[PDB]
Design a protein around this ligand. Structure first.
Ligand code: ICS
Ligand code: ICS
Ligand code: CLF
Ligand SMILES: [Fe+3]
Ligand SMILES: [Fe+3]
Lengths: 482, 510, 510, 483
C-alpha cells in the first residue's frame, strides 16, 4: 500500500531486467530509467539510450521505414497516388488505418483512403519490377487523371533485388508531365518508423523542391507560415489552423494532413515554419532554413497552457498586431477553457497516467493532462532520438518511469505494477490493458475521436479521458459471488 | 463553436460555420480541380467506357481484397496451445499483422519478429534467429514457437531449418522444444496460402518419420475465418450432438475472445500440442475451406489419410453435406435435435422468402467464403451476380461456374478471380445490384455506388463483436438470414419514410 | 409504367410519373388542407405549447402501447402441453388475438371462441360454453382447455364455473378433463393482467385443496415475452449449467417455433400438465416479470411458497442477481463456464463503451421490459431519459425512480406511467434523444421525429425472426449490446457518407 | 394417385363431418358442397350452400366481427377523419394499421388512418357509462387534431350492452364543434361476422353524411362522372384501377373508401354512375343512391386481363362512342404488358391447382386472373358471403370445385392436406400452417405486403408473386437428405 515512486519504478526496472537472457538484458538496461531531479525550464534529467536496433524476439511495438514514409509523411497528401511498391501486404495493413483527415472526392480528386500496389508476384522478384512499375504509372495516368503526382513507396524487396525506381521516375515524369517521387523507404532500412520520416523528407527536397517553380504567381504576405508536422488526426490540423488564422497568420500549407502537392511546392515562399511534430519533419525545416533562410520554431497545441504559450511565442516573432491577435484568441477561448476545466477537472484530478507513443506525443500531451489535474508517472517513445528524450525533461517530473522502445513484457509488468488510472498508447496495447481492469485511451488514433489539438480539441480530450475512466464498466469486472 | 454542454467531436465539429468558412478559404489555394471537373470525372469513372479501361489493367492493383501470407501464418499458429508466432524477418510486418487482427477481433494479438535489418542482406539472419528464439522462449514462456517469414527473409534465402538447429545447439531453446517452421512468401498467393504453409509446417514437425496407429477420428481444419470465435463454438456444439470423435487443428476461438476480468491472458485455449502430435493417427482429415489447405491436405494424404474439402459451409444444403460427411465418418446418425434446428431454419426461409426471391448481389472475399455465400444466396432465390475474389484462381472460377449452373438463379452470374475492389466498383456502377456482401473495405463501394454493404467477411473493422456469433451450422445460417433480412427491411423502411410522399408504403407489418 | 423485366410493386410504382400526375389531379378535389397549413400544423405538433396540451389530456388515448387482457391469457395458456385457449365471448376478439400473435412470431396461433352473439345479452352464454367445449374437445384433441373471457362475457356476467360444470354434466368433456378458467376483463389493466389472471386460474385448478409435499425445486414464470422463444431456451441452458431443479410454468418456446418439415403441429412442447400439478410442492416460485404475476405470486404464497420477482432481467447486473438467487435456492455455485460468459460480456462492453457513454434514450413497452432495458442502458453509461409504459402504474414509476437514483447516469430521467405513444411523440419532439427502444409501432415515432428505432419489445411485426434469439442471460445481453452498437455504427456511417462533404469522418476502423 | 375430383371432394366433406359431435355436424353439413354442372353472364356451375348464419361455438372459425367490418373495413380508411375505437383498448390495437388501405397524407396532421384513437374503457366507464368520457374525447380531438374534418365513433362490444347514447353525444357535439360526427353501432355482438358491420357502416354514411345541406353546390359535373364504390386500395389497388378509368375518359369523383376524404364521400350523389367492385360491402349504399338519387350502379372486376377488358367494355357501353373508343384504346395500350406477363409467367404456372378462402368478394373475384395464368381453382369459399355471393360464384368456378362456407380450422386443414394444391390463397391465420405442410401460400387479403393486384399494372405483380411463392428453392429443402 505505501511506496516511494521513484524507488518503486527502479524496482520494476530491476524486475523486468531479471527476466531476460544476459545478452538481451545488457541491451535493454540502457533503455529503461527513472527521471532524475533537474540541476525553457528542465523539470527532470534523464539519460536513456535511444534510436538503436530492436532486440530480436522481444515483442517491440515499433514499425518500419515504410510506415514512417508511406503511412506517415506521404500517404496523407491527398491529390497524389501513392504506390505501395512490392507485395500486397504493406499497403493492405496500412490502408485507411491512420486517421489523417482530408476533404476530397476519393478515387476522383483525392486518393488517401485507398491501396495502390504493384502486388509483386514471384516473377517480379526474379526479373525485377521496373517494367511493371512503368506500366503501373501509365495505368494511373489513364484511370486517375486528376492525380497531380505519384509517389513510389518502396517495400522490403525493392532494394534487395536491385530495381531502379529513380530511373523509372525520371523517365515517366517526362512522359506524363506529373511529378513522380521515388522513396527508398524499404523496411529493412533503419530501426523504426523514424528513418522513414527522414528518407521521406529528403524525397520532398530532392523531387518536389528541386524543380522549377510552379507558383511564380503566388502573392505573399508578411504573415505567411507553413504548419509543419501536423497530420490532421481526427481534424487536429483544422482545429489548429483556425487559431492561427484568428491570430492573423495565413497558413500557406499544412504538412501533410489535408495537404495538396501545390501546398507542399509553395512552402519555400513562406516567412516562417511552425513545427508541431519535431521528430518527423525537423529535417526539412533545417533544410529550408539553410537553403531559403526560412526560420522554424517548435510549438505545442495540446491543452490551454501550451496553446497560450505557443500562440504568444509564435506572435512574438512577428509584430504588435499579431501579438495582439494572440491575446485576443486566448481571451476568446477562455470561457471554453474554464468550462472544460470546471466540468472535468474535478472528475480527473489526482489520477495517474502512463503513456507510450511514437516520436512526439509521449511528451507533447503531458501538459494537457496536467491542465486537468492528471499526473504522468510513466512515458516513453517507440522511436524518439536523444533530442526527444532531452525535450521530455521540460514536461515530466522527477520519479517518472521512462522506457525507450519498450518491450511487450516490460510494458505489461510496468502497467501491472503501477496500476495507473489510465494508459494512453496504441492499438496493440489497448486490449490487454482493458482486460486488466485499467482504462485505456488510444494516443495515436484518438480511439476514433478527436480532434485533440487546439481549444476545440481540449474539450474533446477531456470528455474522452473522463468517459474512459468514469464509466460503470470497471465496477462490473468482479463477479459479485467471487 | 465548441460547447461543453454538448461537445462536438470531428464529425459535427467541422460542419460548424466557422470551419466551413475556413475550409472554403483553404480550398481556394489548394489547386484542386474545379467542382465541374470533379463531377465530370466522377461520372466518367461510373461509365461503361471506364469499366472497359479498368478491366484492361494489366499491372496496377487498386483496393485489392487480400493480405500477404504471414497474416495467415500468424492466424493459424495462434490456434495452438501456448504457441507464439515468430516471424523471421523485418519487424514492421509484425506491427502490421498484430494491428490488423486486433482491429477485427477487438482483442490482443501477440506475435514477435526476429527484427532483421539491412545487415542481414549481407550476412544473413542467423543471429536474429538464435537470439530471437532465446528471447521469445524466455520472456513469453511458450509451449511452441511457430516460425514464419517476411518477404525480406525470403529474398535473402535464409535456411530456417539450419538456423533453428543452430539455435538449439547454442541453447536458445531446449533440444526437445517444438519450433516448427514454414516459408511464407508475401509474393506468392495470399494470407490463405500462409495459413496452409504454416499449418503444414506444424504438422510436418510433429508427424515426420512416424507410422500411424490408425483410429477412426477425424481431424477438422477450419481455415482462415473472421468468424472463428462463433464458428468454432458452433462446430463443437454440432460435433458434440453427433458424438463424433474429432480433433480441430488450429482453434483460435478462445485466443481471440478472452474475458475482461482483471487478468490479461496472453494465451488461451487452442489445439493441444499432444493432440496435434496424435492427429497423424486419424483416418480422415477434413478442411472447411479448400483454399486454406491444399498443401496441408496433400501432406495428410502422405500418411494415408482420406481427405475432403468444403467451401465455407453456409446455409441448408452445405450444412446438410457437412453433417452427412460427418455421419459417414463416424457411423453416427444426425440426431433429432439437429434435425429440429434444420426444420426451424427451413421455416424461417419459407416465412421470409418473398423478401429474398430475385434479390441481386455482389459478393467478395476469400474464395471459399465467396463460394459458400453464393450457394446460400442461390438457396434463397437470389442471384449472386458479381462474385469476386482477388485471391481466387481459374480453378475457383470453374468451381463457381459449376455452382451457378446448378440453379436457375445462377444464370448470368460471373466469378472474377484476381480482380480487386476498383474492378468491383465498375461492376456495381454499370450493372447495379441490390446488396453487396463483403468486408469493411466495401464501405467505400457503398459510398461510391450507393450499394448497401453487409459485412460477412474478414476484416470487419467498423462494427463490433460480429465475430462472436456463428455463420456456420443451421444456427449460423439463421443468423445470416436475419442479417440479410434486417438489411432489406431497414432499406424498405428508409425508402418509405417521407411523410405524404413515400410513406403510403410504410407498412407496420412486413 | 410497369415492366416485366423489372416489375414495380406499390412502393416504386406510385412514384412513376403517370401516377404522380393522377394523384396530383385527385388531390385538387379531395378538399384536404393546403400544403402551407400542413406545415404550420405539423410544426405546431412538435412544439412545447402542443406538448402541454397533449399532456393535459384526460380522456382520449392515442396510439397506446398495450393490448387487452385476453391476449395475455391466450399467450400464457399456449405454454402448457396440448392446451387450447378457449375465449368465452365474441368471436371477433379471437380472430384478432390469433392474427396479432401470428404477425409477431411468423407462426400459427390457435385459439377458439364460444361465439356469443346478441342473444346472450338476454339469455346468457350457457349453450355457447356447453356446445363450444364439446366441439373444441372433439375437433382439436386438447389435453387441457383454458377458458378466458371477452369484454361482452364480462359485462353479461356469465358464471364460468357453473357453465363448465354443466358442460361436464352434459358430456361435453370427460368429468376429469381439465378446464381451468379465468375472468379476463379488457377494461381492467392490460394483456399483462390477463397473463396473471389466466395463469392463476390454471394453477388454482390444479392446486386447490391440496397440501404440499415440500421439495426444494423452484417454479419459474417467464411472463409475457416477445422474445420467449430465444429467452426460454437461454434460460433452460443456464439452469442446466447450474444444475438447478426447476419447473417453468408456461413455456411457449416450442409452440411458437415449430419446424416446416411437411407436418403442421397444432401443439408443441409446453409445461406438462403433471408438472403444473406437482408445482404446488415447490418451496419457491419466481417470476421474471413482476407485472405479469402479482395475483399468481399471491396465490403461490397461499401454499407457503416463498416468492421473488424480477424485472425482465437484461445485462450484467440483472443477470448476476438472477444467478445469485438461483444459487441461494439451489445451493449450487455459478459454474466456471457461466463466469467465462460473464467476463466475455464485460470485455465487449469495455471494448465498445466509447460509443455508448452519454447516449440518450427513449424506452417504452411493458413495465418490466422498460425497467430492465433502462437498467441495462445505465450500465452502458447511457441515459434512459424518456421511459414510458402505457400499462405502468404509479408503483412502477416509483421503482423506476429508485433505479434512476441508483446511478449518476439517471439524473435526467423520468418514467411516464399511463401515457401513450402520442405523448411519447411530444417528448421526442421537444427533448430530443439519440435512440428510441420499443416495438414496431415506434416506427411512426421514427418517421415523425427522426429518432431511430431499435425493436426490443412486443410486437415486432416489420422485422422477421428476432424472437428466435435471446435477450436474457449474458448471451442475450451480448446480443442486445451488438444490436445497439450496430444501430449506432449504421447511423455514424450514414452521417459521414457524403463524398467531399461529410466523409472526412467515414472511418474504416471504429 | 388416380382420383375423380368431384367424388374425392365429396369424400373429404364426409371425412370432416365425421369428426364433429352430432349437433355441430348437422349445422356444418349445410355449409360444405361440391359445385355441380350448370343448367344447359354464363353459369359454369350450380350449388346450394347455406351462408350468413351464426358460427358454431368452439370450432375455430376464421371470421371476425361487425367492428372489423365497420371500423376495419369501411370507415377506417377514410383519411381525413378521426375514427374512435370506442370501448376497451384491444379492438383498436389489433386493428391498428393491419389492413393495407393505402392513402396519401401526413399522418397525425391531415390524415389519421394508421393510428389508434380510443376511449380506453376502464371499469368505471362500464359501471357509470362512457358518454361523458366520449364528450371529453371529442373536445380533445378537436383541439389536438384540428385538421380532422370529421369524427367517427366505432362502437366496441360494451357500448350497446351498457346503454350508452352515442347518437345523443354525436348530435350535441356536432353543433358545438361544427364537424360531422358519425356514431356507428358496430358492436361485435351484432350479426355473425364482418358482414353486418358493412351494412351498419353503409347506413351510417346514409344517415349521418348524406343528411343536411349540400356542402358542394359549386361542384362542376361532367357527363362521365363516376364513383368507384368498394375498392379499399389494398397496396394501391384503387390507384391502379383509377388510372384505367381515367385513361378511358371517365372522371372519378370519389373512390370508397381507400384514400377517400369526407368531401369525396359527401359528393357521391353528384355522380352519374356507381361502379361497384366489392358488391358485398357496399351494395347497400348503391341501392340507396339508386332509390334516392336515381344513380344507377354496376358491378365490375379488375382482377386480370380477361376481367379488366370485359369490365372496361361493359362500363363504356353505358356511356357513348367516345368512352367505348377509350376502352378499346386502353385495352390496346396495355396488351403488350399483358402479353409479356403471360409469356413470362404462364409457362411457370399453367396447370397448377389453387385453393382459396377469403371474406366476401375475392373468393370468386380473383379466379379469372388465376385462369389467365393457366391456373385452376379446385376449392373456394367465403368467411361471410351471402347467398347472392355463392350464386355469383357459379359464373367463375367449374363443376367439381369444393365449396366451403365459414370453414372451420379443422375442415380447411383436412381439405388442404387431402387435396395438396400447388398454392393456397387465404389469410394470415391460415398462412403458416399451410407452409409448414410444404404447400405454397400467398395472402389474399394483405397481398402478402405486395400489390397492387387490381388493373394491368397489378396483373404483373400478381403473376410475379404467385410464381415466386410456388417456384422457389425452399420447397426442395423440406426433406432432409438422410431421411
Ligand atoms: S508523425 Fe509520428 S506513432 Fe509525429 S510516426 Fe506516428 S501522427 Fe505517433 S507520436 Mo502513430 S512522431 Fe505523428 C506519430 Fe508522433 S503515426 Fe502519429 S500517433 S506526432
Ligand atoms: S371489403 Fe371485405 S376479408 Fe370486400 S371485409 Fe375483408 S379489402 Fe376480404 S375478400 Mo380481408 S368483402 Fe375487401 C375484404 Fe373482401 S378486409 Fe378485405 S381482403 S374485397
Ligand atoms: S518491414 Fe512483405 S508484403 Fe509487407 S507486410 Fe511484410 S511480408 Fe507482407 Fe514489412 S511492412 Fe512492408 S514487408 Fe517490409 S516495408 Fe515494412
Ligand atoms: Fe475484446
Ligand atoms: Fe414461422
Amino acid at each position: 500500500d505505501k511506496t516511494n515512486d521513484s524507488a518503486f519504478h527502479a524496482r520494476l526496472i530491476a524486475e523486468v531486467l531479471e527476466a531476460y537472457p544476459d545478452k538481451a538484458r545488457k541491451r535493454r538496461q540502457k533503455h529503461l530509467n527513472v527521471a532524475g531531479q533537474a540541476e525553457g525550464v528542465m523539470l527532470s534529467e534523464c539519460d536513456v539510450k535511444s534510436n538503436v536496433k530492436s532486440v530480436p524476439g522481444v515483442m517491440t511495438i515499433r514499425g518500419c521505414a515504410y510506415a514512417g514514409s508511406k503511412g506517415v509523411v506521404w500517404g496523407p497528401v491527398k491529390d497524389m497516388v501513392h504506390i505501395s511498391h512490392g507485395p500486397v501486404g504493406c499497403g493492405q495493413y496500412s490502408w485507411s488505418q491512420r486517421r489523417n483527415y482530408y476533404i476530397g472526392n476519393t478515387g476522383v480528386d483525392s486518393f488517401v483512403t485507398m491501396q495502390f500496389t504493384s502486388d509483386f508476384q514471384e516473377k517480379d522478384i526474379v526479373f525485377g519490377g521496373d517494367k511493371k512499375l512503368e506500366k503501373i504509372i501509365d495505368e494511373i495516368d489513364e484511370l486517375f487523371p486528376l492525380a497531380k503526382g505519384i509517389s513510389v513507396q518502396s517495400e522490403c524487396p525493392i532494394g534487395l533485388i536491385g530495381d531502379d525506381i529513380e530511373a523509372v521516375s525520371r523517365k515517366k515524369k517526362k512522359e506524363i508531365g506529373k511529378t513522380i517521387v521515388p522513396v527508398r523507404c524499404e523496411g529493412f532500412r533503419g530501426v523504426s518508423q523514424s528513418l522513414g520520416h527522414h528518407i521521406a523528407n529528403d524525397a520532398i527536397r530532392d523531387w518536389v523542391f528541386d524543380g522549377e517553380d510552379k507558383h511564380a504567381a503566388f502573392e505573399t504576405t508578411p504573415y505567411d507560415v507553413n504548419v509543419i508536422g501536423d497530420y490532421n488526426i481526427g481534424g487536429d490540423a483544422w482545429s489548429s489552423r483556425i487559431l492561427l488564422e484568428e491570430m492573423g497568420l495565413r497558413v500557406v500549407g499544412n504538412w501533410s494532413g489535408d495537404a495538396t502537392l501545390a501546398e507542399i511546392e509553395r512552402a519555400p515562399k513562406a516567412k516562417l515554419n511552425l513545427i508541431h511534430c519535431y521528430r518527423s519533419m525537423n529535417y526539412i525545416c533545417r533544410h529550408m532554413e539553410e537553403k531559403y533562410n526560412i526560420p522554424w520554431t517548435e510549438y505545442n497545441f495540446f491543452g490551454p497552457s501550451q496553446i497560450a504559450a505557443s500562440l504568444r511565442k509564435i506572435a512574438a516573432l512577428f509584430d504588435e498586431k499579431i501579438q495582439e491577435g494572440a491575446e485576443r484568441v486566448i481571451a476568446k477561448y477562455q470561457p471554453l477553457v474554464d468550462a472544460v476545466i470546471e466540468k472535468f477537472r474535478p472528475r480527473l484530478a489526482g489520477k495517474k497516467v502512463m503513456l507510450y507513443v511514437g516520436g512526439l506525443r509521449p511528451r507533447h500531451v503531458v501538459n494537457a493532462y496536467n491542465d486537468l489535474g492528471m499526473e504522468i508517472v510513466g512515458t516513453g517513445y517507440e522511436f524518439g532520438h536523444n533530442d526527444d528524450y532531452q525535450r521530455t525533461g521540460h514536461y515530466v517530473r522527477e520519479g517518472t518511469l521512462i522506457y525507450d522502445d519498450v518491450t511487450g513484457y516490460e510494458l505489461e509488468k510496468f502497467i501491472e505494477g503501477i496500476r495507473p488510472d489510465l494508459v494512453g498508447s496504441g492499438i496493440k496495447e489497448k486490449y490487454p490493458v482493458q482486460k486488466m481492469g485499467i482504462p485505456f485511451r488510444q494516443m495515436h488514433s484518438w480511439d476514433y475521436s478527436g480532434p485533440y489539438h487546439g481549444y476545440d480539441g481540449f474539450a474533446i480530450f477531456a470528455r474522452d479521458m473522463d468517459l474512459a475512466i468514469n464509466n460503470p464498466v470497471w465496477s462490473m469486472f468482479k463477479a459479485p459471488w467471487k | 463553436p465548441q460547447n461543453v454542454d454538448k461537445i462536438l467531436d470531428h464529425a459535427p465539429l467541422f460542419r460548424e460555420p466557422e470551419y466551413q468558412e475556413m475550409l472554403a478559404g483553404k480550398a481556394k489555394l489548394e489547386n484542386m480541380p474545379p467542382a465541374d471537373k470533379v463531377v465530370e470525372i466522377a461520372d466518367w469513372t461510373k461509365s461503361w467506357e471506364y469499366r472497359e479501361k479498368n478491366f484492361a489493367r494489366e499491372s496496377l492493383s487498386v483496393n485489392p481484397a487480400k493480405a500477404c501470407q504471414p497474416l495467415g501464418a500468424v492466424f493459424v499458429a495462434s490456434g495452438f496451445e501456448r504457441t507464439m508466432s515468430f516471424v523471421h524477418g523485418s519487424q514492421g510486418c509484425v506491427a502490421y499483422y498484430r494491428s490488423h487482427l486486433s482491429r477485427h477481433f477487438k482483442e490482443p494479438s501477440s506475435a514477435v519478429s526476429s527484427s532483421m535489418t539491412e545487415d542481414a542482406a549481407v550476412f544473413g539472419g542467423l543471429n536474429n534467429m538464435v537470439d530471437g528464439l532465446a528471447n521469445t522462449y524466455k520472456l513469453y514462456d511458450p509451449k511452441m514457437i511457430a516460425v514464419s517469414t517476411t518477404c525480406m527473409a525470403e529474398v535473402i534465402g535464409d535456411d530456417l531449418h539450419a538456423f533453428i538447429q543452430t539455435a538449439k545447439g547454442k541453447g536458445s531453446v531446449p533440444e526437445e522444444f517444438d519450433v516448427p517452421f514454414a516459408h511464407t512468401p508475401a509474393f506468392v498467393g495470399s494470407h490463405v496460402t500462409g495459413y496452409d504453409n504454416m499449418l503444414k509446417g506444424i504438422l510436418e514437425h510433429f508427424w515426420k518419420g512416424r507410422t500411424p496407429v490408425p483410429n477412426r477420428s477425424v481431424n477438422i481444419i477450419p481455415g482462415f475465418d473472421g468468424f472463428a470465435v462463433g464458428n468454432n463454438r458452433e462446430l463443437k456444439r454440432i460435433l458434440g450432438m453427433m458424438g463424433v470423435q474429432y480433433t480441430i487443428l488450429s482453434d483460435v476461438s478462445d485466443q481471440f475472445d478472452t474475458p475482461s476480468d482483471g487478468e490479461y491472458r496472453m494465451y488461451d485455449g487452442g489445439t493441444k500440442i499432444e493432440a496435434a502430435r496424435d492427429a497423424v493417427n486419424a483416418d480422415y482429415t477434413i478442411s472447411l475451406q479448400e483454399y486454406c489447405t491444399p498443401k496441408t491436405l496433400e501432406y495428410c494424404q502422405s500418411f494415408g489419410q482420406k481427405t475432403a474439402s468444403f467451401h465455407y459451409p453456409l446455409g441448408i444444403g452445405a450444412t446438410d453435406d457437412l453433417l452427412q460427411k460427418l455421419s459417414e465418418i463416424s457411423g453416427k446418425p444426425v440426431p433429432q435435435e439437429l434435425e429440429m434446428e434444420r426444420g426451424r431454419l427451413v421455416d424461417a426461409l419459407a416465412d421470409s422468402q418473398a423478401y429474398l426471391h430475385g434479390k441481386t448481389y455482389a459478393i467478395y472475399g476469400d474464395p471459399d467464403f465467396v463460394y459458400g455465400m453464393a450457394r446460400f444466396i442461390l438457396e434463397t432465390g437470389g442471384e449472386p451476380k458479381h462474385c469476386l475474389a482477388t485471391n481466387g484462381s481459374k480453378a475457383w472460377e470453374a468451381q463457381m461456374q459449376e455452382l451457378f449452373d446448378s440453379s436457375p438463379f445462377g444464370v448470368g452470374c460471373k466469378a472474377w478471380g484476381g480482380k480487386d475492389l476498383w474492378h468491383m466498383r465498375s461492376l456495381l456502377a454499370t450493372e447495379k445490384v441490390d446488396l453487396l456482401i463483403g468486408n469493411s473495405y466495401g464501405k467505400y463501394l457503398e459510398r461510391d455506388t450507393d450499394t448497401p454493404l453487409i459485412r460477412l467477411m474478414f476484416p470487419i473493422f467498423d462494427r463490433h463483436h460480429h465475430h462472436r456469433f456463428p455463420v456456420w451450422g443451421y444456427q449460423g445460417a439463421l443468423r445470416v438470414l436475419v442479417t440479410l433480412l434486417d438489411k432489406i427491411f431497414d432499406k424498405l423502411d428508409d425508402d418509405t419514410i417521407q411523410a405524404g410522399v413515400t410513406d403510403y408504403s410504410f407498412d407496420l407489418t412486413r
